[PDB]
Amino acid sequence: GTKITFYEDKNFQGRRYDCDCDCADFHTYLSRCNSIKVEGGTWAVYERPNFAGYMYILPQGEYPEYQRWMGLNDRLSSCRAVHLPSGGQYKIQIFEKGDFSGQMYETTEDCPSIMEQFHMREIHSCKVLEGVWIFYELPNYRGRQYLLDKKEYRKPIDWGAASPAVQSFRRIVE
Amino acid sequence: GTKITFYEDKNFQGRRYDCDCDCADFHTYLSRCNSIKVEGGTWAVYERPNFAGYMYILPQGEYPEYQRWMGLNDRLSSCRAVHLPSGGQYKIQIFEKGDFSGQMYETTEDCPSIMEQFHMREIHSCKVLEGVWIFYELPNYRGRQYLLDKKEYRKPIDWGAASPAVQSFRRIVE
Protein backbone atom coordinates (compact mmCIF):
# COMPACT_ATOMS: atom_id res chain seq x y z
CA GLY A 1 0.00 0.00 0.00
CA THR A 2 3.06 2.25 0.32
CA LYS A 3 3.88 4.44 -2.69
CA ILE A 4 4.35 8.07 -3.72
CA THR A 5 3.43 9.93 -6.91
CA PHE A 6 5.47 12.91 -8.14
CA TYR A 7 3.77 15.41 -10.46
CA GLU A 8 5.56 17.89 -12.72
CA ASP A 9 3.15 20.79 -12.29
CA LYS A 10 1.13 22.33 -9.50
CA ASN A 11 -1.96 20.73 -7.96
CA PHE A 12 -1.22 17.17 -9.08
CA GLN A 13 -1.28 18.15 -12.77
CA GLY A 14 1.00 17.23 -15.69
CA ARG A 15 3.26 14.24 -16.18
CA ARG A 16 3.44 11.95 -13.18
CA TYR A 17 5.91 9.39 -11.84
CA ASP A 18 5.14 6.63 -9.35
CA CYS A 19 7.65 5.01 -7.00
CA ASP A 20 6.72 1.93 -4.98
CA CYS A 21 10.12 1.47 -3.32
CA ASP A 22 13.46 3.35 -3.57
CA CYS A 23 13.73 5.04 -7.00
CA ALA A 24 17.28 6.25 -7.48
CA ASP A 25 16.85 8.54 -10.50
CA PHE A 26 13.65 9.74 -12.17
CA HIS A 27 14.87 12.92 -13.86
CA THR A 28 14.34 11.49 -17.37
CA TYR A 29 10.64 11.19 -16.45
CA LEU A 30 10.10 14.45 -14.52
CA SER A 31 12.23 17.54 -15.11
CA ARG A 32 10.94 19.14 -11.87
CA CYS A 33 8.34 18.38 -9.17
CA ASN A 34 5.61 20.77 -8.06
CA SER A 35 3.07 18.32 -6.59
CA ILE A 36 3.31 15.09 -4.61
CA LYS A 37 0.87 12.49 -3.30
CA VAL A 38 2.21 10.13 -0.64
CA GLU A 39 -0.30 7.30 -0.75
CA GLY A 40 1.32 5.33 2.05
CA GLY A 41 4.32 5.08 4.28
CA THR A 42 6.79 7.86 4.98
CA TRP A 43 9.26 8.97 2.31
CA ALA A 44 12.49 10.88 1.99
CA VAL A 45 12.66 12.71 -1.35
CA TYR A 46 15.99 14.04 -2.61
CA GLU A 47 17.01 16.95 -4.79
CA ARG A 48 19.74 15.15 -6.74
CA PRO A 49 19.91 11.59 -8.11
CA ASN A 50 21.09 8.73 -5.93
CA PHE A 51 19.83 10.24 -2.68
CA ALA A 52 22.01 13.35 -2.82
CA GLY A 53 21.47 17.00 -2.14
CA TYR A 54 18.69 18.54 -0.13
CA MET A 55 16.35 15.92 1.32
CA TYR A 56 12.82 16.28 2.71
CA ILE A 57 10.67 13.94 4.82
CA LEU A 58 7.00 13.61 3.79
CA PRO A 59 4.48 11.44 5.67
CA GLN A 60 1.29 10.10 4.11
CA GLY A 61 -0.61 12.99 2.61
CA GLU A 62 -1.07 15.21 -0.39
CA TYR A 63 1.16 18.19 -1.21
CA PRO A 64 -0.23 20.45 -3.96
CA GLU A 65 2.76 22.80 -4.09
CA TYR A 66 6.42 22.24 -3.42
CA GLN A 67 6.29 24.59 -0.42
CA ARG A 68 4.00 22.13 1.35
CA TRP A 69 6.86 19.70 1.99
CA MET A 70 9.02 22.70 2.96
CA GLY A 71 10.85 22.38 -0.37
CA LEU A 72 13.05 25.30 -1.30
CA ASN A 73 12.33 24.73 -5.01
CA ASP A 74 10.78 22.17 -7.37
CA ARG A 75 13.93 20.09 -7.98
CA LEU A 76 13.63 16.46 -6.96
CA SER A 77 15.09 13.43 -8.67
CA SER A 78 15.24 10.49 -6.19
CA CYS A 79 13.46 9.04 -3.17
CA ARG A 80 13.49 6.13 -0.70
CA ALA A 81 10.78 4.75 1.53
CA VAL A 82 11.47 5.15 5.24
CA HIS A 83 11.59 1.74 6.92
CA LEU A 84 10.43 1.66 10.54
CA PRO A 85 11.99 -1.17 12.56
CA SER A 86 9.25 -2.96 14.41
CA GLY A 87 9.13 -3.03 18.15
CA GLY A 88 8.65 0.70 18.07
CA GLN A 89 11.72 1.59 20.10
CA TYR A 90 13.58 4.84 19.61
CA LYS A 91 16.77 5.73 21.42
CA ILE A 92 19.55 8.06 20.30
CA GLN A 93 22.91 9.25 21.61
CA ILE A 94 24.21 12.67 20.53
CA PHE A 95 27.82 13.71 20.98
CA GLU A 96 29.61 17.02 21.40
CA LYS A 97 32.63 15.96 19.33
CA GLY A 98 33.39 13.72 16.38
CA ASP A 99 33.89 9.96 16.64
CA PHE A 100 31.65 9.60 19.71
CA SER A 101 33.81 11.83 21.91
CA GLY A 102 33.14 14.58 24.44
CA GLN A 103 29.78 15.27 26.05
CA MET A 104 27.11 12.69 25.29
CA TYR A 105 23.34 12.77 25.87
CA GLU A 106 20.90 9.88 25.49
CA THR A 107 17.16 10.20 25.00
CA THR A 108 14.16 8.29 23.72
CA GLU A 109 12.14 11.49 23.18
CA ASP A 110 11.77 14.21 20.55
CA CYS A 111 13.84 17.38 21.05
CA PRO A 112 12.50 20.64 19.52
CA SER A 113 15.40 22.64 21.03
CA ILE A 114 18.85 21.17 21.68
CA MET A 115 19.86 24.50 23.26
CA GLU A 116 17.17 24.48 25.93
CA GLN A 117 17.41 20.78 26.76
CA PHE A 118 21.13 19.99 26.39
CA HIS A 119 22.88 23.39 26.16
CA MET A 120 24.66 22.43 22.95
CA ARG A 121 24.63 24.48 19.77
CA GLU A 122 26.08 21.70 17.56
CA ILE A 123 26.06 17.92 17.19
CA HIS A 124 29.23 16.30 15.85
CA SER A 125 28.59 12.56 15.93
CA CYS A 126 25.60 10.36 16.64
CA LYS A 127 24.57 6.81 17.46
CA VAL A 128 21.01 5.73 16.67
CA LEU A 129 20.63 2.83 19.08
CA GLU A 130 16.95 2.24 18.22
CA GLY A 131 14.45 3.67 15.73
CA VAL A 132 14.64 6.27 12.95
CA TRP A 133 15.15 10.00 13.47
CA ILE A 134 15.39 13.35 11.68
CA PHE A 135 18.04 16.01 12.33
CA TYR A 136 16.94 19.61 11.64
CA GLU A 137 19.15 22.64 11.17
CA LEU A 138 17.05 25.20 13.03
CA PRO A 139 15.01 24.53 16.20
CA ASN A 140 11.43 23.38 16.27
CA TYR A 141 11.94 21.12 13.28
CA ARG A 142 12.63 23.90 10.74
CA GLY A 143 15.32 24.45 8.13
CA ARG A 144 17.38 21.83 6.35
CA GLN A 145 16.53 18.21 7.20
CA TYR A 146 18.63 15.07 7.51
CA LEU A 147 17.46 11.46 7.86
CA LEU A 148 19.13 9.26 10.51
CA ASP A 149 18.50 5.52 10.19
CA LYS A 150 19.74 2.91 12.66
CA LYS A 151 23.51 3.32 12.34
CA GLU A 152 26.56 5.19 13.62
CA TYR A 153 27.53 8.66 12.43
CA ARG A 154 31.13 9.49 13.26
CA LYS A 155 30.88 12.94 11.62
CA PRO A 156 28.15 15.32 10.38
CA ILE A 157 28.94 14.48 6.76
CA ASP A 158 27.60 10.99 7.64
CA TRP A 159 24.06 12.26 7.98
CA GLY A 160 24.90 14.25 4.84
CA ALA A 161 25.38 17.69 6.40
CA ALA A 162 28.08 20.15 5.39
CA SER A 163 28.20 21.73 8.86
CA PRO A 164 27.48 20.38 12.35
CA ALA A 165 24.48 22.72 12.78
CA VAL A 166 21.73 20.73 14.48
CA GLN A 167 19.15 22.43 16.66
CA SER A 168 16.27 19.97 16.86
CA PHE A 169 15.53 16.33 16.19
CA ARG A 170 12.62 13.94 16.49
CA ARG A 171 11.37 10.46 15.79
CA ILE A 172 9.82 9.24 12.57
CA VAL A 173 6.48 7.82 13.65
CA GLU A 174 3.46 6.86 11.58
CA GLY B 1 20.40 0.25 -13.60
CA THR B 2 21.16 -0.48 -9.97
CA LYS B 3 19.42 -3.84 -9.88
CA ILE B 4 17.53 -4.70 -13.11
CA THR B 5 17.37 -2.95 -16.48
CA PHE B 6 14.69 -3.68 -19.08
CA TYR B 7 15.22 -2.86 -22.76
CA GLU B 8 12.62 -2.53 -25.50
CA ASP B 9 14.62 -4.12 -28.32
CA LYS B 10 16.86 -7.17 -28.47
CA ASN B 11 20.52 -7.05 -27.47
CA PHE B 12 20.14 -4.11 -25.09
CA GLN B 13 19.16 -1.68 -27.84
CA GLY B 14 16.22 0.74 -27.60
CA ARG B 15 14.36 2.42 -24.76
CA ARG B 16 15.26 1.13 -21.31
CA TYR B 17 13.81 1.21 -17.83
CA ASP B 18 15.58 0.68 -14.49
CA CYS B 19 14.00 -0.75 -11.34
CA ASP B 20 16.03 -0.54 -8.14
CA CYS B 21 13.51 -2.59 -6.17
CA ASP B 22 9.79 -3.34 -6.75
CA CYS B 23 8.17 -1.63 -9.75
CA ALA B 24 4.45 -2.23 -10.09
CA ASP B 25 3.93 -0.87 -13.61
CA PHE B 26 6.27 0.30 -16.35
CA HIS B 27 4.06 -0.27 -19.38
CA THR B 28 3.91 3.50 -20.04
CA TYR B 29 7.66 3.63 -20.61
CA LEU B 30 8.13 0.24 -22.33
CA SER B 31 5.67 -1.18 -24.83
CA ARG B 32 7.41 -4.58 -24.60
CA CYS B 33 10.71 -6.02 -23.37
CA ASN B 34 13.19 -7.93 -25.52
CA SER B 35 16.31 -7.89 -23.31
CA ILE B 36 17.26 -7.47 -19.65
CA LYS B 37 20.39 -6.81 -17.60
CA VAL B 38 20.18 -7.99 -13.98
CA GLU B 39 23.06 -6.11 -12.37
CA GLY B 40 22.62 -7.89 -9.03
CA GLY B 41 20.45 -10.19 -6.93
CA THR B 42 17.55 -12.27 -8.21
CA TRP B 43 14.44 -10.72 -9.72
CA ALA B 44 10.88 -11.86 -10.37
CA VAL B 45 9.43 -10.21 -13.50
CA TYR B 46 5.76 -10.28 -14.55
CA GLU B 47 3.96 -9.92 -17.86
CA ARG B 48 1.08 -7.76 -16.57
CA PRO B 49 1.14 -4.77 -14.22
CA ASN B 50 0.89 -5.11 -10.46
CA PHE B 51 2.74 -8.46 -10.52
CA ALA B 52 0.17 -10.30 -12.60
CA GLY B 53 0.21 -12.79 -15.43
CA TYR B 54 3.16 -14.90 -16.47
CA MET B 55 6.12 -14.69 -14.12
CA TYR B 56 9.77 -15.55 -14.61
CA ILE B 57 12.72 -15.63 -12.18
CA LEU B 58 15.97 -14.07 -13.40
CA PRO B 59 19.20 -14.67 -11.49
CA GLN B 60 22.03 -12.17 -11.90
CA GLY B 61 23.25 -11.90 -15.46
CA GLU B 62 22.48 -10.56 -18.92
CA TYR B 63 19.62 -11.61 -21.18
CA PRO B 64 19.77 -10.50 -24.84
CA GLU B 65 16.49 -12.10 -25.99
CA TYR B 66 13.21 -12.85 -24.32
CA GLN B 67 13.72 -16.57 -24.80
CA ARG B 68 16.79 -16.31 -22.56
CA TRP B 69 14.53 -16.06 -19.48
CA MET B 70 12.09 -18.75 -20.70
CA GLY B 71 9.78 -15.95 -21.82
CA LEU B 72 6.73 -16.95 -23.81
CA ASN B 73 6.90 -13.52 -25.45
CA ASP B 74 8.34 -10.03 -25.06
CA ARG B 75 5.52 -8.71 -22.80
CA LEU B 76 6.67 -7.53 -19.36
CA SER B 77 5.24 -4.86 -17.07
CA SER B 78 6.34 -5.26 -13.42
CA CYS B 79 9.12 -6.70 -11.29
CA ARG B 80 10.04 -7.53 -7.71
CA ALA B 81 13.35 -8.35 -6.10
CA VAL B 82 13.29 -11.78 -4.49
CA HIS B 83 14.34 -11.71 -0.86
CA LEU B 84 16.46 -14.58 0.43
CA PRO B 85 16.06 -14.91 4.22
CA SER B 86 19.21 -15.14 6.28
CA GLY B 87 20.53 -18.61 6.99
CA GLY B 88 20.64 -20.58 3.76
CA GLN B 89 17.85 -22.86 4.99
CA TYR B 90 15.58 -24.65 2.52
CA LYS B 91 12.76 -27.01 3.44
CA ILE B 92 9.41 -27.70 1.74
CA GLN B 93 6.49 -30.06 2.29
CA ILE B 94 4.26 -31.01 -0.63
CA PHE B 95 0.82 -32.49 -0.12
CA GLU B 96 -1.26 -34.79 -2.28
CA LYS B 97 -4.42 -32.97 -1.17
CA GLY B 98 -5.46 -29.37 -0.77
CA ASP B 99 -5.05 -27.59 2.55
CA PHE B 100 -2.14 -29.57 4.00
CA SER B 101 -3.98 -32.90 3.98
CA GLY B 102 -3.24 -36.32 2.52
CA GLN B 103 0.06 -37.96 1.72
CA MET B 104 3.00 -35.66 2.31
CA TYR B 105 6.60 -35.59 1.13
CA GLU B 106 9.29 -33.31 2.51
CA THR B 107 12.60 -32.32 0.95
CA THR B 108 15.48 -29.91 1.39
CA GLU B 109 16.79 -30.32 -2.15
CA ASP B 110 15.82 -29.46 -5.70
CA CYS B 111 13.52 -31.92 -7.50
CA PRO B 112 14.00 -31.95 -11.30
CA SER B 113 11.31 -34.64 -11.69
CA ILE B 114 8.25 -35.00 -9.45
CA MET B 115 7.31 -38.17 -11.34
CA GLU B 116 10.67 -39.78 -10.74
CA GLN B 117 11.23 -38.79 -7.11
CA PHE B 118 7.67 -38.76 -5.77
CA HIS B 119 5.62 -40.83 -8.25
CA MET B 120 3.10 -38.07 -8.91
CA ARG B 121 2.62 -35.10 -11.21
CA GLU B 122 0.38 -32.93 -9.04
CA ILE B 123 1.18 -30.81 -5.98
CA HIS B 124 -2.01 -29.67 -4.25
CA SER B 125 -0.83 -27.64 -1.24
CA CYS B 126 2.46 -27.05 0.44
CA LYS B 127 4.38 -25.40 3.24
CA VAL B 128 7.66 -23.55 2.75
CA LEU B 129 9.27 -24.08 6.14
CA GLU B 130 12.55 -22.47 4.99
CA GLY B 131 13.79 -20.55 1.99
CA VAL B 132 12.10 -19.67 -1.28
CA TRP B 133 11.37 -21.97 -4.20
CA ILE B 134 10.13 -22.05 -7.79
CA PHE B 135 7.42 -24.38 -9.20
CA TYR B 136 7.43 -25.38 -12.91
CA GLU B 137 4.82 -27.07 -15.09
CA LEU B 138 7.18 -29.35 -17.01
CA PRO B 139 10.12 -31.48 -15.77
CA ASN B 140 13.61 -30.11 -15.45
CA TYR B 141 12.62 -26.51 -14.79
CA ARG B 142 10.98 -25.89 -18.16
CA GLY B 143 7.70 -24.23 -18.98
CA ARG B 144 5.69 -21.91 -16.80
CA GLN B 145 7.14 -20.64 -13.51
CA TYR B 146 5.62 -19.84 -10.10
CA LEU B 147 7.32 -18.20 -7.11
CA LEU B 148 6.81 -19.37 -3.50
CA ASP B 149 8.10 -17.12 -0.70
CA LYS B 150 8.21 -18.59 2.83
CA LYS B 151 4.55 -19.05 3.73
CA GLU B 152 1.68 -21.53 3.39
CA TYR B 153 -0.07 -22.50 0.16
CA ARG B 154 -3.33 -24.33 0.79
CA LYS B 155 -4.42 -24.41 -2.87
CA PRO B 156 -2.56 -24.23 -6.22
CA ILE B 157 -4.03 -20.76 -6.78
CA ASP B 158 -1.99 -19.55 -3.79
CA TRP B 159 1.13 -19.76 -5.95
CA GLY B 160 -0.64 -18.30 -8.97
CA ALA B 161 -1.54 -21.56 -10.70
CA ALA B 162 -4.71 -22.45 -12.57
CA SER B 163 -4.26 -26.19 -11.88
CA PRO B 164 -2.25 -28.49 -9.59
CA ALA B 165 -0.01 -29.30 -12.59
CA VAL B 166 3.58 -29.15 -11.33
CA GLN B 167 6.42 -31.35 -12.49
CA SER B 168 9.57 -29.84 -10.94
CA PHE B 169 10.67 -27.38 -8.30
CA ARG B 170 13.95 -26.07 -6.98
CA ARG B 171 15.50 -23.64 -4.52
CA ILE B 172 16.30 -19.99 -5.21
CA VAL B 173 20.05 -19.75 -4.58
CA GLU B 174 22.36 -17.01 -5.75
Q: Report the alpha-carbon distance of residue B129 to residue B153 in Å, rounded.
A: 11
Backbone angles phi, psi at A153, to 5 degrees: -125, 100
Amino acid at A170: R
Helix (H) or strand (E) holding B115: helix B114-118
Nearest to B20 among A3, A18, A23 (CB): A23
Partners of B23 on chain A (C-beta within 8 Å) are: 20-21
B50 touches chain A (CB under 8 A): no
3-state secondary structure B16-28: EEEECCCECCCCC
Of A98, A139, A104, the C-alpha closest to A118 is A104
User: Domain ranges in chain A?
Assistant: 1-84, 85-174
How many CA within 13 A on the CB side of residue B26? 32
Q: Say if residues A17 and A2 touch (Cβ distance below 8 Å).
A: no
SS3 B12: helix
A16 touches chain B (CB under 8 A): no
- Please name every residue paired with B168 in a beta bridge, in sequence order, or none if there are none: B136
Q: Report the alpha-carbon distance of residue A59 to residue A42 in Å, rounded.
A: 4
How many CA within 13 A on the CB side of residue A94? 29
**Resolution in angstroms, to 1 decimal, for this deposition?**
2.1
Of B62, B66, B75, B58, the C-alpha closest to B34 is B66
Backbone angles phi, psi at A157, to 5 degrees: -65, -5
Write the CATH number of the domain with boundaries A1-84: 2.60.20.10
B130 touches chain A (CB under 8 A): no
Q: Report the alpha-carbon distance of residue A88 to residue A174 in Å, rounded.
A: 10
Q: Report the alpha-carbon distance of residue A163 to residue B2 in Å, rounded.
A: 30
Q: Report the alpha-carbon distance of residue B51 to residue B44 in Å, rounded.
A: 9
As to burial, measured by CB atoms within 10 angstroms (0-12 exposed, 13-18 middle, 19+ buried), residue A135 is buried
Backbone angles phi, psi at B49, to 5 degrees: -60, 165
**CB environment A145-156: b (16+ within 10 A), e (fewer):** bbbbbeeebbeb
Long-range contacts of B143-151 (CB under 8 A, 24+ apart): B143/B70, B143/B167, B144/B54, B145/B54, B145/B55, B145/B56, B145/B57, B145/B70, B146/B55, B147/B44, B147/B55, B147/B57, B147/B82, B148/B92, B149/B82, B149/B83, B150/B85
Q: Say if residues B162 and B137 touch (Cβ distance below 8 Å).
A: no
Amino acid at A167: Q
Q: Say if residues B152 and B109 touch (Cβ distance below 8 Å).
A: no
3-state secondary structure chain A: CCCEEEEEECCCEEEEEEECCCECCCCCCCCCCCEEEECCCCEEEEEECCCEEEEEEECCEEECCHHHHCCCCCCCCEEEECCCCCCCCCEEEEEEECCCEEEEEEECCCECCHHHHHCCCECCEEEEEECCEEEEEECCCEEEEEEECCCEECCHHHCCCCCCECCEEEECCC
Nearest to B20 among A3, A24, A29 (CB): A24
This structure was determined by: X-ray
Q: Say if residues B122 and B135 touch (Cβ distance below 8 Å).
A: no
Same fold, B1-84 and B85-174: yes
Q: Report the alpha-carbon distance of residue B174 to residue B108 in Å, rounded.
A: 16
Q: Report the alpha-carbon distance of residue A129 to residue A141 in Å, rounded.
A: 21
Partners of A30 on chain B (C-beta within 8 Å) are: none
How many CA within 13 A on the CB side of residue A108? 4
Contact A3 B20 (CB under 8 A): no
Write the CATH number of the domain with boundaries A85-174: 2.60.20.10
Of B172, B174, B151, B154, the C-alpha closest to B164 is B154
Helix (H) or strand (E) holding B55: strand B52-58
Amino acid at A168: S
